[PDB]
Amino acid sequence: EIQFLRTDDEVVLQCTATIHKEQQKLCLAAEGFGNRLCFL
């Protein structure tokens, strides 16, 4: 059966990018220590 997202779950935010005619998967990431901005 199709699984659902509950609250107390560990997830990763993923997206796709089309660069030079290819698809790349990128996950949102952040360090938190010494750097608050988010990268991929």
């Binding site: 699984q3 360090e31 220590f33 010494g34």
Partner: protein
């Protein structure tokens, strides 16, 4: 059992790998090419090699237990086993050997969340401070 994985050294941020000339060695993130960095836990040292396990889209079934279970680390690509050099605190160099030794069992001890946090903070801080020192030297 049989699931491939990578072992990352938290303090240095480098991944364990096997080069043919100089056996076990730590390598940077950009050079961990799965073929040399893939390792596997084995219940027994005998050459079973069942493989062909189907990946399960879920939490799975708990197999390897902390402390109680005895593990045998095996390189996926070459099939070599982790074993000690047996010649010289303790400082016993770790090597890859095809038939290993009589006692190659490995136990696993989980670390605390605070300890893991502190280790990763240490690695980030040493990276940033080394960058700062190199910039000042330049």
């Amino acid at each position: 059992w049989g699931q491939p994985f990578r072992l990352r050294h938290v303090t240095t941020g480098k991944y364990l790998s096997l080069m043919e000339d100089k056996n076990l060695l730590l390598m940077d993130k950009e050079k961990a090419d799965v073929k040399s960095t893939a390792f596997t836990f084995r219940s027994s040292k005998e050459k079973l090699d069942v493989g062909v396990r189907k990946e399960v889209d879920g939490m799975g079934t708990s197999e390897i237990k902390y402390g109680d279970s005895v593990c045998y680390i095996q390189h996926v690509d070459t099939g070599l086993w982790l074993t000690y050099q047996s010649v010289d605190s303790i400082q016993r160099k770790a090597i890859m050997h095809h038939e290993g030794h009589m006692d190659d069992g490995i136990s696993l001890s989980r670390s605390q969340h605070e300890e893991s946090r502190t280790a990763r903070v240490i690695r980030s801080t040493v990276f940033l401070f080394n960058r700062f020192i190199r910039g000042l030297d330049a």
